[PDB]
């Protein structure tokens, strides 16, 4: 039993993790639950401990991307999640409301707050077999949208109470950020569906003009794209993220430390290297220090810029290498939200790609 499937999955925004879903006391898994997607690997040890092998085959995109007809794939670990214990002391109804607002993980461990520096470390192991045209994020620092921040059909941006948001949710259903008239789904015969609880199955009707804050680019991502290893930092100072503003730097095209900018956003390639030069069949360790950009909430200003420092270490061809690949660079990095940031690693296959991805991750620590 050299590879042990870890198939349990948590919707961290909408559900607590049961203790039996927690991996090694500090992780939950998200994305496709195929046996091969995530496995504890006793054949590829790091620091005398099992690593995690991640694998998405061609057919393993189970999610939709932003554009029409686009798909994406996910098999990742999240360091942030809530448990039953996190709701100890709160009113009984707190959890139900957290599920609807998608704020359950707000109550959990693993959040680095707004404007709080933190250090991180992790290691990655890229097999020789990894295709050079993969399109995958293997480690990311993810933001936490304001879940009752909405835009009306008429175009007013406003944050509601939870109770008021629950009222809106009676007639609106949000698919990602986009509001639709809430309706009940029918079977192929035109008869109403009933769920396991005997309730109607709610469905998105036509768009109704409402928006809610949801998704957005990760403040920091490590990945491969177009034959490049890259580190990409994103910033968004708009109180309500505008998802139509596709401000994003290309590893291929964008030169290093030259931000692609919009009115509110910034996307910087902090570092890149040709895929061919990335060490294969060895552990590559990243030490990351982040000073988050700080924002003025409803004022939508950048208060202070951020900073990024990255060291990369490995052993290959009978020499140890240490390179200061991001050398204390002033950078814009973060999001204008109430809550801060959480780490994930694994596979997030983006850029409308189905090129297979398989590699190992281990040795995670934060401050
Ligand atoms: O659609 C884009 O602009 C885009 C292009 C990049 O090739 C891809 O890495 C990037 O993926 C986003 C993702 O968009 S997607 O269309 O859903 O895949 C985005 N989702 S969204 O719902 O907020 O738009 C989020 O998950 O971040 C992905 C990675 O972002 S970045 O690391 O490229 O900045 O989007
Ligand atoms: Ca926001």
The 3D shape can be described as globular
**Beta-strand residue fraction:** 35-45%
Structural class given helices, strands, pairing? mainly beta
Order of helices and strands: EEEEEEHEEEEHEEEEEEEEEEEEEEE
Helix content: under 10%
> Which molecules are bound besides the chains?
a molecule of 2 linked components (SUS-GCD), calcium ion
First-last Cα distance = 33 Å
**CA-based gyration radius:** 21 Å
Number of β-strand runs:
25
Q: CATH topology of the largest domain, which one?
A: Jelly Rolls
What is the highest CATH level, the class of the largest domain? Mainly Beta
Main beta sheet: strand number and arrangement?
Answer: 10 strands, mixed
CATH architecture of the largest domain: Sandwich
What is the domain total for the residues? 2
Q: How many helical stretches? A: 2
InterPro entries: Polysacc_lyase
Keywords: Lyase, Signal
GO molecular function: lyase activity
Protein name: Heparin lyase I
Question: Would you kindly provide a brief summary of this structure?
Answer:
This protein is mostly beta strands.
Molecular structure report:
By secondary structure, the protein is mainly β. The protein contains two helices and 25 strands. Strand 11 and strand 12 form a beta hairpin. A molecule of 2 linked components (SUS-GCD) binds next to strand 15. It is classed as lyase.
Notable traits:
binds calcium ion, 367 residues, 25 strands, mainly beta, duf1285 like fold, 8-stranded antiparallel sheet, monomer, binds a molecule of 2 linked components (SUS-GCD), Polysacc_lyase, 2 helices
